[PDB]
Write a protein that binds this ligand. Structure first.
Ligand code: PRO
Ligand code: PRO
Ligand SMILES: [O]
Lengths: 262, 268
């Protein structure tokens, strides 16, 4: 049996990712693959316990689901994560954010790296996320929205609340960026809400500022977000304040899935 | 502590490798690094027992095989971030070491490596199913016109596996001036009449990457200068050898197909 030889990003693609801080590959996974992933997302939402947020999200699924454990090692994903981070990689965080059709809430503006630095002791922004589109992403279903190029200022300040981790993945974020600081960013750089079909992957930088609106449409916007971190860039588990299902502690380099008879 | 971020080949370098079947990177390893590998190789030639090979005219060391399984330095070398990312890149897979060898081609007495394709041996002796494998040749010495460089038919990998005369049962003659599978002189001449011959050169510390199926050879070294090469053969994990048609020991043909991971920078 045969896995297709690993495909990496073109030099132009890499350049676009570096410039903008994000990049879309369309139709990475086919419909049958996507349906498998949706079914498993549904299992995880139904049985996740304390790993579910209210359903707003579920976290850490690759540690509990075999299908998700295999996904993060996929030859469609792992080679590009390696290429972009220029290292072996492991999964820092895994989450599925079901931005539900009628009543799907905001994600206020944030840089993931701000959270991961302060909550988990990640030392540099040498990480990225791959967001798999379980549904078509349009203007109307609350797309992920970015300031392009906004990753190249490093972190930028954000006020904190809670002496806990509970408010890290709510509508009200622990480290959001204020109206003024965003107005600045937006006035200079733009806003972009990249779009795509079911099965696409949206790659984005740990430090790019991003957000998403409420879901207007009658349509869902299920995303599977896999955060790859550089093994060299492993988080300092002695600054770590969160469970494994939010911030991994096993830094074993991932290997790609090979084709087997089962 | 920090390893330099993984460097891979440019698209132009990769196009050159696929077209010619070989590619030189100059000055990959520095002098101090080469010197560590030189000293470890001297240790393996002195302690490798059955894994050592001698030139016929003499008792002088021709080569030692399998050192990554016995030497910790060599076990780490194959995982080096100067090497592993490029092997993964060119083979478009995770990889593992099929074969490891050090070929000391001494200053006045190194003998011939007759024309051959590595893949022919690996396919028939070891059960490698396709030529999705490559060798990285580390130059422990400057490779010049005069110290018996590996010499290739550029582009000769792309007309598949050429047919060769088998000589005998088993494998001891896979490592000799007398090769088990050497090439039909009439097809050699053909290959060469249409493709030519090239002996890549470079300074100490360079790496010469070459395709598993590229016809290659080397002449004797009659310079006053050694040509020590550390040759690491990476194979794609998908392309793992069929260990059920395998005729040779571990130190010629690996059986552990665990994907290699890169060495990280630690405090020791
Ligand atoms: O707490 C976290 O790490 C994720 C990333 C930003 C939103 N929630
Ligand atoms: O026997 C082998 O496997 C190597 C490749 C060709 C010459 N010796
Ligand atoms: O060879």
């Amino acid at each position: 049996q045969i896995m297709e030889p690993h495909d990496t990003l073109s030099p132009a693609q890499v350049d676009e990712y570096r410039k903008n801080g994000f990049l879309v590959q369309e139709h990475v996974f086919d419909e049958e693959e996507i349906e498998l992933l949706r079914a498993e997302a549904a299992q995880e939402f139904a049985s996740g316990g304390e790993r579910v947020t209210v359903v707003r999200g579920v976290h850490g699924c690759h540690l509990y689901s075999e299908v998700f454990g295999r996904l993060v090692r996929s030859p469609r994903l792992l080679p590009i994560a390696r290429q972009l981070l220029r290292d072996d990689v492991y999964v820092h965080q895994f989450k599925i954010n079901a931005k539900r059709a009628f009543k799907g809430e905001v994600w206020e503006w944030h840089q993931d790296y701000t959270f991961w630095h302060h909550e988990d002791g990640m030392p540099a922004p040498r990480a990225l996320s791959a967001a798999i589109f379980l549904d078509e992403v349009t203007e109307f279903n609350g797309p992920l929205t970015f300031v392009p190029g906004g990753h190249g200022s490093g972190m930028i300040d954000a006020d904190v609340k809670g002496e806990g981790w509970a408010n890290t993945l709510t509508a009200s974020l622990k480290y959001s960026l204020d109206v003024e600081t965003m107005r600045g960013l937006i006035e200079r750089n733009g806003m972009v809400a990249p779009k795509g079909p079911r099965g696409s992957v949206l790659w984005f930088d740990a430090n790019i500022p991003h957000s998403s609106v409420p879901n207007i449409s009658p349509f869902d916007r299920g995303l599977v977000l896999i955060t790859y971190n550089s093994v060299e860039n492993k988080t300092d588990v002695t600054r770590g304040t969160r469970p494994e299902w939010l911030a991994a502690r096993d830094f074993t380099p991932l290997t790609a899935l090979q084709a087997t008879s089962f």
